[PDB]
Amino acid sequence: YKNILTLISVNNDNFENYFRKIFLDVRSSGSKKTTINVFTEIQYQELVTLIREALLENIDIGYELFLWKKNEVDIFLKNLEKSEVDGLLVYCDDENKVFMSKIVDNLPTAIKRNLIKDFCRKLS
């Protein structure tokens, strides 16, 4: 893998712990790059403040962060038409599982097929 599509939707208090996991999984995939899409209502600056440590430990990872409000999933999906990702990582917590599951269900066939890890749908 060389370009991982990472999707995440969790409550604010789970961002730091989940992001450290995201980077560990991206590292394990062999990829040096990942485009991280966060489905949340908070602002970019607030997110970065929460995940300061996760980002600090992964300065050498080629990542880009994109935040999407709940009504912007269609923009995210449209933009995927121009993506070149070859691997997919999915993350969520219980409060956002149903929502994330719907996003996953609508991913382009070729992208959905490249699911590497799903730390979301099977969570209790």
- Determine if 124 is a binding residue for its own copies (CB under 8 A): yes
Distances, alpha carbon 106 to alpha carbons 29, 67, 99, 101, in Å: 23, 18, 11, 9
The phi and psi torsions of 45 (rounded to 5 degrees) equal -60, -40
Positions in 27-46 near its own copies (CB under 8 A)? 28
Rounded Cα distance between 93 and 16, Å, is 13
Determine the interface stretch with its own copies among 42-50, 54-62, 75-83, 101-109 (rule: CB under 8 A): 75-83
Q: Which is nearer to its own copies, 78 or 113 (CB)?
A: 78
Site for its own copies, rule CB under 8 A? 21, 25, 28, 68, 71-72, 74-75, 78-79, 82, 117, 119, 122-124
